[PDB]
């Protein structure tokens, strides 16, 4: 898939395509790869293998529930359930999570990663495509977060054979 997030002007947007691909065939095209958590106050988009992607998401959620939705602490708490003696079980999936305050990228072997200065994050086979297009627009236009997301997503669905154009975009007032 291609999941990208841009944060600009007190706006945070996370968007992604909807192509569930099994092998070199396509099973579903209208998949929702970005969803809202903790009383819609936090966005989550996921790449990787379906199931794991889902378990990795449902996991972050229970954490969010136990920590008053503190995006940053929940991420770390969750990471710490892999970074210990008794492994949790490696999940082949990544999440891009974001709330009003932070944008974070969490992986299935436990390690939270912050964005670079530009505050842009993208994951998925077509991630770098969207990332490149996004960095370009953020550095060279006044386009809103939403527009850049929408725009980069397409530029990427056009290069990646695993990313389609049916988008699901969510922004955070």
């Amino acid at each position: 898939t291609t999941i990208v997030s841009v944060r600009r002007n007190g706006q945070v947007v996370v968007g992604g395509d909807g192509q569930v691909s099994l092998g070199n065939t396509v099973m579903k095209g209208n998949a929702r790869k970005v969803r809202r958590l903790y009383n819609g106050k936090v966005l989550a988009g996921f790449a990787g293998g379906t199931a794991d992607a889902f378990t990795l998401f449902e996991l972050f959620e229970r954490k969010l529930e136990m920590h008053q939705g503190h995006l940053l602490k929940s991420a770390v708490e969750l990471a710490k359930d892999w970074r210990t003696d008794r492994a949790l079980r490696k999940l082949e999936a990544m999440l891009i999570v974001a709330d009003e305050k932070e944008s974070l990228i969490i992986t299935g072997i436990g390690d939270v990663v912050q964005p670079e200065e530009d505050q842009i994050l993208a994951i998925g086979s077509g991630g770098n495509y969207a990332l490149s297009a996004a960095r370009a627009l953020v550095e060279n236009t006044e386009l809103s977060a939403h527009e850049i997301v929408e725009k980069s997503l397409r530029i990427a669905g056009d290069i990646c054979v695993f990313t389609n154009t049916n988008f699901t975009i969510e922004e955070l007032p």
């Binding site: 229970r62 008053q68 602490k73 991420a75 770390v76 390690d111 990663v113 912050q114």
Partner: protein
């Protein structure tokens, strides 16, 4: 002969701030107690308590409301953690000791001293239990399916008999849990109440939700309640001969602060006030002895100072890459 719904809520309003739905709920409950027992006899027995499941975050009044409900009804009371069993009949056994003491207390409140006769004193407490006893099961959401998940799921099955009404023996005789009013509380952050076993989910008809406490709520809890924290210190310092006074802005500041940490870190509800209050009454509390006659005027500046600085976490670094 007994208080009424509005009557009881008013009594509770004297100790708990907010949480109306909750108050109302336990009110109509304690009332249904007087309603039955007015009924003929066939129905008198047939009608049973409409148990309550309280759902709210940490320390927002769930327990005080129940403990006060029992207090103003002068009813045998007992609180137990549900996980405490991960002997359940002890719950009733303990509830009876409570009533036996609450009843010894009366046949003695009346005018050596042989206005006793155990045989009839026991029957007296034993009724108190069977009639108006109250059990409060805490953090029941901890024994919901969510592994040794059967060890806890088992605790539910173990509570059924009491809730579903049965008999258990106490060192005072036999008692029936048929009319004991049960109140279970839980936060239910991960589990939903519909995750309890059906047999039990239906014995807890009344579901009532409690709210999280706000800065504004703290402000009131700080001063309004009978024996609030401020009323307490005033009283204590008084003994050392110190006269203390809180300015409104002080109280506002204290709360704004409790609430503030509660939000930035682990939210532990109203308890947070005892925390901040003790950190502030810190210095005075000690010096108060040899400070007789003086009078401390605790305003915003004092509070702002005595509280020092409280942390907005560095989960940062260390764990993030």
């Amino acid at each position: 002969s007994e208080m009424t719904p509005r009557e009881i809520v008013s009594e509770l309003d004297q100790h708990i701030i907010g949480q109306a739905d909750a108050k109302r709920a336990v009110a109509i409950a304690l009332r249904n107690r007087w309603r039955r027992m007015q009924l003929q006899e066939p129905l008198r027995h047939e009608v049973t308590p409409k148990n309550i499941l309280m759902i709210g975050p940490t320390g927002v009044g769930k327990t005080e409301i129940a403990r006060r409900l029992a207090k103003l009804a002068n009813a045998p009371f007992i609180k137990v953690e549900a996980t405490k069993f991960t002997e359940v009949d002890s719950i009733i056994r303990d509830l009876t000791d409570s009533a036996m003491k609450l009843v010894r207390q009366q046949e003695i409140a009346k005018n050596a001293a042989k206005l006793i006769n155990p045989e009839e004193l026991k029957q007296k407490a034993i009724d108190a239990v069977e009639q108006n006893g109250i059990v409060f099961i805490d953090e029941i959401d901890k024994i919901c399916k969510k592994g040794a998940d059967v060890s806890r799921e088992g605790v539910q099955r173990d509570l059924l008999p009491l809730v579903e009404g049965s008999t258990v023996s106490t060192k005072h005789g036999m008692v029936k849990t048929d009319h004991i009013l049960f109140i279970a509380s839980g936060a239910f952050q991960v589990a939903r109440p519909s995750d309890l076993i059906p047999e039990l989910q239906g014995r807890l008809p009344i579901r009532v939700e409690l709210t999280a406490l706000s800065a504004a709520d703290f402000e009131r809890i700080l001063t309004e309640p009978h024996a609030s924290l401020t009323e307490q210190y005033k009283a204590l310092m008084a003994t050392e001969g110190v006269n203390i006074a809180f300015t409104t802005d002080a109280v506002k500041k204290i709360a704004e602060a409790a609430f503030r940490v509660n939000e930035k870190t682990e939210n532990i509800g109203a308890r947070r006030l005892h925390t901040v209050m003790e950190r502030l009454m810190d210095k005075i509390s000690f010096s108060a002895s040899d400070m007789n006659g003086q009078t401390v005027n605790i305003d915003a500046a004092y509070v702002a100072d005595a509280l020092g600085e409280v942390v907005e976490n560095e989960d940062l670094s260390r764990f993030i890459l």
